[PDB]
Amino acid sequence: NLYFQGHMWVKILSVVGARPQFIKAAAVSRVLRASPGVREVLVHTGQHYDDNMSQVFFEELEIPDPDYHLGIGGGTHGQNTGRMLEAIEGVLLKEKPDWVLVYGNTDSTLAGALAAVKLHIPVAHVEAGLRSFNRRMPEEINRILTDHASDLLFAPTETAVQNLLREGIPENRIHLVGDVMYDAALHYGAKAERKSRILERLGLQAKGYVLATIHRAENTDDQERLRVILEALAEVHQEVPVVFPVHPRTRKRAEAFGLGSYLEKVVALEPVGYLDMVMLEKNARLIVTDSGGVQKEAYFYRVPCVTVREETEWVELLKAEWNYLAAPQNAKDLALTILHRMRTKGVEIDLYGDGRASQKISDFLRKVGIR
């Protein structure tokens, strides 16, 4: 035996529930699965369950079948989170992992953190420390409580680091690693370029359209806010075609509120896969969204962005002038704002790291040691 023979396994269990969590997990899981002395276990809470919200990401992003599908979703915050909490705990007692990874800030994120910390299993938070400072948002609650329940905090931004320090989280548990969604954009771009012909199937050409997505509860749960958004987009479409993959939350609200006819006024799609989405974003003249990740991706592709919200967690994008908030207060103004910004670019700047946040995270999990 010449070389040193290591005898130590760590079991890392990831908890995912929703579309953006599968994307982040695809970047991180792949590095962990390739890491010596790492056994990864993946739990799918069931929060997102339609194939174009879940299965399609497992296919295109090459994620192994979850070890557990919990089958929980569609309910209230109370039912989803409550049921996930108890179910995730069951798994934890079975699998007895050394670390629990949770991602972003869905109800699934919070359920996993809570299930784990009370069993004294160390929680690590991928995308830690983002603040909208708007507690009406369920996502803000989620990230605050998850962060304060975590033993490791993988911040993507300096602002995120500052947020955590300001809430008394000790500096030694915080690591600025950048953003794994940039890793993912880099890792899957060639496959998107190879495999999507969404542009060919919509008869669209590069820079000849605007891409839009809207699903924030505060935008969809209010009939008249939603109307401002659908009406604005419809106005924009007369000037530049608007492509709009429509989230199931958004469709369900549009329907119940009777606003369905507005979707005839733009190029509305079922929700798309990541590969088609990359191609759509890459080639847009402008992106209008209330998504977190999409704001970032627009910048990756150096496409201008409008965020239809009263705030963003991703403030560096505003400072760099790649992003611009426009709250949905009236349709005329929203539309005018969109058309004006279609002519803009931000400044050249390198945000979100080197595309290897996944490797940093894996390295930090493996070397923390038994406290």
Added chain:
Amino acid sequence: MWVKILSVVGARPQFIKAAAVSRVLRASPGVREVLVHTGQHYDDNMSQVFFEELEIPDPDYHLGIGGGTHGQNTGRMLEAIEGVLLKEKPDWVLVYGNTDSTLAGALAAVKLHIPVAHVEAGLRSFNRRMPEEINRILTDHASDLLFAPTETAVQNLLREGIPENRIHLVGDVMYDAALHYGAKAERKSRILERLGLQAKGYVLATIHRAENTDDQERLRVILEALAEVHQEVPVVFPVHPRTRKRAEAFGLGSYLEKVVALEPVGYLDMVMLEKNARLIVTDSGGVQKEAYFYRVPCVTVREETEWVELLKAEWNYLAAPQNAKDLALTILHRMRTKGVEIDLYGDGRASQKISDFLRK
């Protein structure tokens, strides 16, 4: 115009706090209170006895959730509490202390955008293994109003970036309760008579922290320490059912027969035992304050406490359970001590301060 306050209570120390605050809210103009009992504590001697002897109004809801894991108790409470909130739509949800019930109620509420107010906010053990440290950090960070009992708790909240306009130093509602119920206790408690004890003729012990009961070696040290003490001065020991169950589980039941072990007692009986003890040994949060209220020296069987002013003032002493004999001696040696004269925890109107803030 009128204001609706829904209160969530699960366990014994929450009933006691609720009693103080309830009496004042109910009596207050422009206020309905709805009371939700999660079911976390359910034995008659941990729950009904408090409603009855403290004349707490019947809970509008009894969820009947208890006896399971953290994840079962909390996740079920979360769903069940939310259901009631959807029905009642209060202006404020009120939580107390730091049980699994506390967290479920806060979390149920904040996702419905109902303002949450934390009664007894900002206490910190800095021991993140305690399920109660997590409960309070998360509850505090989910709350809109923070009723701190001490300057330390104010400081703890500011250091975690919680804004000062949300923090009110109101003292301790458990002081209110002690003052209000003191006379009834005097009139109605016959527990000294029943147990054959004389005033200042025994030590009072309670023990129930998870780190003391789930850990066999810690639990053994404690029970062994108390049995040694009892040889010198009788030890009176109302045993938390968790503690009873863990002691039976680890085969330490016999130590309970070597002191004056009791089932858990009512508040009135407890006040009488506390008042008349030579010294109190506990790992309870509330009992360490109460010993101070009755100028009875306290020994706290833990590595830390949230109530650090009780150490500062020499009314309370830490004794971690490392060694049965070291613990027995520390207990016996603290018996004839006393702390300095100082007023902690306010004027006994913490509840009315609380009530005023809510109405305004």
